[PDB]
Amino acid sequence: IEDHISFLEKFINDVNTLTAKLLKDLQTEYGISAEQSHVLNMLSIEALTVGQITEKQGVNKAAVSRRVKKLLNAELVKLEKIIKLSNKGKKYIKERKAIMSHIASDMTSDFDSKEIEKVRQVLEIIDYRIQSYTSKL
Amino acid sequence: RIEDHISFLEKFINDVNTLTAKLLKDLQTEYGISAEQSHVLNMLSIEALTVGQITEKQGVNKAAVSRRVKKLLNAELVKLIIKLSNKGKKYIKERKAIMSHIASDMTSDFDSKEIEKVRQVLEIIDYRIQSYTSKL
Ligand SMILES: CN[C@@H]1[C@H](O[C@H]2[C@H](O[C@H]3[C@H](O)[C@@H](O)[C@H](NC(=N)N)[C@@H](O)[C@@H]3NC(=N)N)O[C@@H](C)[C@]2(O)C=O)O[C@@H](CO)[C@H](O)[C@H]1O
Numbered sequence: 724i725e726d727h728i729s730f731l732e733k734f735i736n737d738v739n740t741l742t743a744k745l746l747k748d749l750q751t752e753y754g755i756s757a758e759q760s761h762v763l764n765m766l767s768i769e770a771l772t773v774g775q776i777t778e779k780q781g782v783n784k785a786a787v788s789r790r791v792k793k794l795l796n797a798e799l800v801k802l803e804k805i806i807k808l809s810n811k812g813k814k815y816i817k818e819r820k821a822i823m824s825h826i827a828s829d830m831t832s833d834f835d836s837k838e839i840e841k842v843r844q845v846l847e848i849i850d851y852r853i854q855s856y857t858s859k860l
Numbered sequence: 861r862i863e864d865h866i867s868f869l870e871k872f873i874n875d876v877n878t879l880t881a882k883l884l885k886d887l888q889t890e891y892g893i894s895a896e897q898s899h900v901l902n903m904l905s906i907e908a909l910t911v912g913q914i915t916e917k918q919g920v921n922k923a924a925v926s927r928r929v930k931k932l933l934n935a936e937l938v939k940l941i942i943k944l945s946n947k948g949k950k951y952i953k954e955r956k957a958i959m960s961h962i963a964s965d966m967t968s969d970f971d972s973k974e975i976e977k978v979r980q981v982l983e984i985i986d987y988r989i990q991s992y993t994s995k996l
């Protein structure tokens with residue numbers, strides 16, 4: 724009811740907590756900060772502007788600005804303008820996908836692919852409505 | 861296949877995060893706090909947990925979580941041990957009110973059976989996650 728909304732929040736928290744730890748090294752190895760790995764992952768799906776990243780993230784623009792250019796200086800992202808990605812940034816995303824796909828597998832080895840399929844389409848539909856509602860305000 | 865589910869879930873969460881941000885901006889402004897100060901009140905919406913664990917859960921390094929702690933202690937949305945005051949409780953109700961009616965509106969045409977199965981799958985996935993985490 725609003726149980727679900729709490730579960731979801733708690734679930735997202737848990738997923739972030741696991742991602743932070745699982746990625747502690749690759750981030751370090753790269754100079755990268757957590758909040759920067761995130762931006763690097765946000766750009767993994769679409770190009771942005773400091774403004775778009777700041778809307779989609781809700782944190783004061785300056786902060787997004789501090790990291791946006793720390794990332795350019797490191798040749799992880801690139802201007803075209805907009806915020807794209809370089810291999811070093813892709814390869815990081817590929818190294819991030821490798822770890823991620825590895826434990827995710829470990830704990831879903833016993834799942835039923837069909838039970839997952841219907842679950843997926845329920846969510847894909849909710850994802851659709853989330854994006855769509857966000858478009859306005 | 862699993863790389864796919866991972867991308868979607870990541871995207872699904874990036875969108876939920878996005879939405880909660882647009883939906884709660886005016887209110888966080890109306891209460892004079894940032895998004896990260898809002899976050900800090902929502903776990904304390906459940907419980908009360910002092911430092912040490914306060915960064916552990918987050919993943920956001922050294923004393924920033926304490927930086928926000930006194931930041932919020934000052935607006936008196938937080939108390940002392942560090943619990944949550946009557947002040948923050950009001951905020952949360954308002955947060956929950958906005959969140960729930962939207963989620964309700966986006967879910968109201970689904971068969972309770974479908975939603976529960978979703979819940980049950982995320983619930984078993986959250987179970988493995990926690991346990992795996994605990995393997996520190
Ligand atoms: C726009 N940048 C603001 C500025 O960050 C600084 C930022 O400085 C960073 C150091 O290089 C880094 O080694 C230093 N150490 C790291 N481990 N990253 C950062 O903590 C430091 N951050 C910062 N000064 N804000 O690099 C400078 C180029 C800067 O962007 C000046 O604008 O000062 C920050 C103070 O909060 C502002 O929030 C930022 O928005």
Ligand SMILES: CN[C@@H]1[C@H](O[C@H]2[C@H](O[C@H]3[C@H](O)[C@@H](O)[C@H](NC(=N)N)[C@@H](O)[C@@H]3NC(=N)N)O[C@@H](C)[C@]2(O)C=O)O[C@@H](CO)[C@H](O)[C@H]1O
Pocket residue numbers: 731732733735736758761780781782876877880881884895896897898899900902903918920955
């Ligand atoms: C349990 N609290 C979680 C947290 O809630 C907080 C959340 O706070 C988060 C900021 O938005 C985010 O930009 C910021 N994101 C980063 N990538 N750094 C978070 O750091 C911040 N909270 C914090 N780090 N403790 O933003 C506020 C809108 C909030 O939803 C309360 O209303 O973030 C939410 C994101 O959807 C989670 O779902 C919630 O469960």
